[PDB]
Symmetry: C5
């Protein structure tokens, strides 16, 4: 009787995880939080490389990094404490004394990362039609609604598939609003800067789109091959956490590095 639990727990409590699956999930989470701490150091040590009016961006990047390290460190431990080896079969099964594994740790902490990540670009690009405050408030409201609806939804990814999908769609609405506003921001920021900055901004747009789209992909991962599909297995757990790590790295570290390069180019 698992109740409103994530599907990792069902897979681990029925079939269990082979050595490769368990060890790979642990390794990918470890790499995630290591990347986050290294990026924190990188952003702190490069603050004076940009003009003062851009250093805020750097700071915010650092801020984000802090949150992520702590989460992906906790989450990491969580994984290894939720599943233990059974010598009789050679697989890792759910160990209830280490609690049920839950991805929600990431959702609430996005309440830090999503606003901040949306906010810092407004310290590097210059708006030509929109108001700074209006864009900021839209970003924050839509991100909060998206995160909260998705966080409520993921609790029912096995118990109540209907609620899962409904909350996912209600979240995707705010996601589309965020995407529209961000495209507006980047198009307005391209105006009046050298072609190098425009190239950096187009790269930022592409990276933003892909890496941010990766997250609902991980949301739906156990069902992307339908019920009782190839992805509703330990392969799906591996894929979920791998996509999470890729999207984390891209949307945080690489995004901050491209913002820093843009700030360097715009600096005098």
């Amino acid at each position: 009787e698992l109740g409103n639990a994530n599907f990792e727990n069902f897979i681990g409590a029925t079939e269990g995880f082979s050595e490769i699956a368990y060890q790979f999930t642990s390794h990918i989470l470890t790499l995630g939080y290591a990347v986050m701490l290294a990026g924190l150091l990188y952003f702190i040590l490069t603050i004076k490389n940009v003009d003062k009016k851009f250093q805020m961006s750097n700071i915010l990047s650092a801020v984000v990094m802090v949150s992520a390290f702590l989460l992906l460190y906790a989450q990491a431990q969580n994984w290894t404490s939720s599943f233990t080896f059974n010598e009789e079969v050679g697989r890792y099964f759910l160990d209830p004394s280490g609690d049920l594994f839950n991805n929600g740790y990431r959702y609430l902490n996005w309440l830090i990362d999503v606003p901040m990540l949306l906010f810092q670009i407004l310290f590097v690009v210059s708006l030509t039609t929109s108001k700074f405050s209006s864009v900021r408030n839209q970003f924050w409201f839509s991100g909060a609604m998206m995160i909260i609806t998705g966080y409520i939804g993921q609790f029912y990814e096995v118990s109540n598939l209907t609620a899962f999908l409904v909350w996912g769609a209600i979240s995707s609405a705010f996601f589309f609003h965020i995407l529209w506003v961000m495209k507006k921001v980047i198009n307005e920021g391209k105006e009046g800067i050298s072609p190098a900055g425009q190239k950096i901004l187009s790269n930022i747009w592409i990276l933003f789109l892909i890496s941010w789209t990766l997250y609902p992909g991980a949301y739906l991962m156990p069902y992307l091959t339908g019920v009782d599909g190839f992805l509703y297995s330990e392969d799906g757990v591996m894929a979920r956490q791998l996509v999470y790590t890729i999207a984390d790295v891209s949307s945080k570290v690489i995004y901050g590095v491209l913002l820093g390069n843009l700030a360097i180019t715009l600096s005098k």
Copy 2:
């Protein structure tokens, strides 16, 4: 089973147990709390040289608070996960005494750091007119100490003795109202003789102070706000209490320090 003078979370977890949603949400919200606290430390450290020297003390005090907050919430997070263990037969988290009983007093005593410093730092940005700096500081510190100590005594009896619970709560509320009075005086005097932007910032600071500080007696009273054997005397009440604690912590510490720093910038 005999629990003695323990918080109502322990009683709920020993009788009904917690569902996956309740337990996981409480853990996530405490994790988010301490993550927010360490990211603000960096923020407040990294933005020290953004204000005139005379205001920088505020920043320092903010950082101090952050440290305290982080540590406490980190500890508190761990304590939660160690006090409740999954029971597979029914699929619910029950009290685990080998991990010690859960107690909110960890917050209360640590407020002995937070409450004075928070009340102290505003006196490094605004300039008093008819009030005396040392008088305001001593009143703040004495009233805060009394409030914290009386509430800390009272919360131990939230289940074992409702009468002492309420009596200590009222005794604490007296000092709380005194603090609100002195703070209103301080804000009104600080408004005198400053720019309109600083006046708007001070108004926002007063509103934030009022709401976020009132949230704490709300969390104190949470299990009984729907009466004896009411709806909030459940795992829903535990979730609500920790959520209110986290919202109040973030608002009264991080956002309060950020608004104070904005005020310091406009005055520079």
Copy 3:
């Protein structure tokens, strides 16, 4: 149930056990202690550039002390929670030998850092007149070392051998009085030739030093301050001992360093 040369906390916890209030309060007070120490470390680092170069050593030494203090009070906190475990049948925390016996001598040996450095740092702010710097330093260090070592030997027999307890305590008290004499000389010489404000600060420093340092033999004698089988030979005595330890730690380290820094500012 033979405990040997163990502290009286272990005897109380092995015979009567601790109630929820007693155990939780001891844990909270130790947690507050180490939080205060880390916050003080941050404060003393951040306020280094507030005084002239010649005084900055004081800050550094303060920070040094903080480090030591933090680590021990963090360790000691852990030790408390690991040494006593909840018994559900009666609802009380009893001695848990798998977590090791509780011992307060961790503090003693760590005073081998604190006592010299604290006594040393005042010699970087005040200017001696008739006394020799190196003589004062050597007297401070030797007397402090002897005091700490003799008290550390004595505290192991606070239950198993009252005679050794009291004899070693008196041997320590001799060196304590020597330290008090030398400190009075140092403060009186430092008052000479400075402004009245610095003299008032020095008087406050002397009062604080006296009270806060006298608090330590008080915690040493705590279980017997009401006689054998007295009121304090209970969990109440355990609470009182750890509370006195925390008050003395905060006063003699953090507030002492803050007053020294204020003096350094007035002398700058």
Copy 4:
């Protein structure tokens, strides 16, 4: 008992067990590794202002690597101590499955930080002549990623499937040789137009790079370097593997960064 696609440390520890020397030495060497990494982090941060601004990026990248290394090695240290428990009846440490199986893959994925950055940072000290900066960088990054991923896949089968082990190892060795080729090109171009002292430093850097990076496939092959049922298919092989890992880590990260910093110093004005 069934272990599946697990490293050979688990098989040795589950069948023969480890003596006190083997277990204690492995723990000590991993501890020394992560201690060295943290000390190097401190060093590279503290010596940033010792070189001209244009070279300071190198320092930063070193520090970045250090962080990764420290964290990873720290975890791995814990993992060792969690996988093997003393049995008083025989006097040997045996596999403890409640602590998870021991796996070297923690290193491999973390090389996804180490290998690019290490290859990247030298491009902030030396000046290329005929090669394009971005071309060299992209080649380094792609070849390193492929090498790491293929070796990481291969090492899971070092006991359960020797054929896949060797095939993935060879596929990885291809990209390793490409990396060596590009690095030799970089060193030859960097020697041009700098003082003889900097050229000597570059020669030492090339020798160190070659040896220290070649040490890693050696640790990959360690249990079989004396054949099946050989001398190295024992606790001696486990000790040798972790010792080679630690020596290669120190040499290829800390000493590499120190030599790069000395080169940057001689090039500074």
Copy 5:
């Protein structure tokens, strides 16, 4: 309970066990050690700008040793408390194998950081006259490595094979005497051409070096300094060994760095 090539602390704790005073004191002394190391790290970082630039390297290298030391002592502290558990029936702490056996080798390998760096940093303050910098450095590093490695091999047999114990100890003592010789030469050359105050500081540094470094073979021999089945082959010997280790660590690292910094200040303009 067969323990094999294990340190004598495990034998004492497995046969007689430790009393409350002995166990608590060993734990306190290790805790004090790592606390001292972290505080010294803070001190050496915060006092960097107190000396001329050319001397600041000393400061840096001191903090590197403080990092290493800190980590090791922290680990060792944990290890002690994890290896011995209270038995309520008799009131003594006995060996607990689930926490691993206690081993001092953690220190030894970490000396591979401490011993070279400590010997290196003095060469950033004093100026040699007749000796060559690189020759002194190479001699220091080689002799220190050999000393550490031979003693590390030997200490595993302090109970199981006293003969190998003593043979490895003597082989190590040879390199120790070589180090003392080179250090005496270095101090004599550094005294030349500096003010009398710096010469007095150098004399004090030499005395400190001699005593604090000689303390380590003392801890090596501690259980047998009173003969076979002597007084020191007891829990008293365990306390004495760890206390000597802590005193030697503090003296040879923190106080050594402080005296070096004082010398650097007196040499500073």
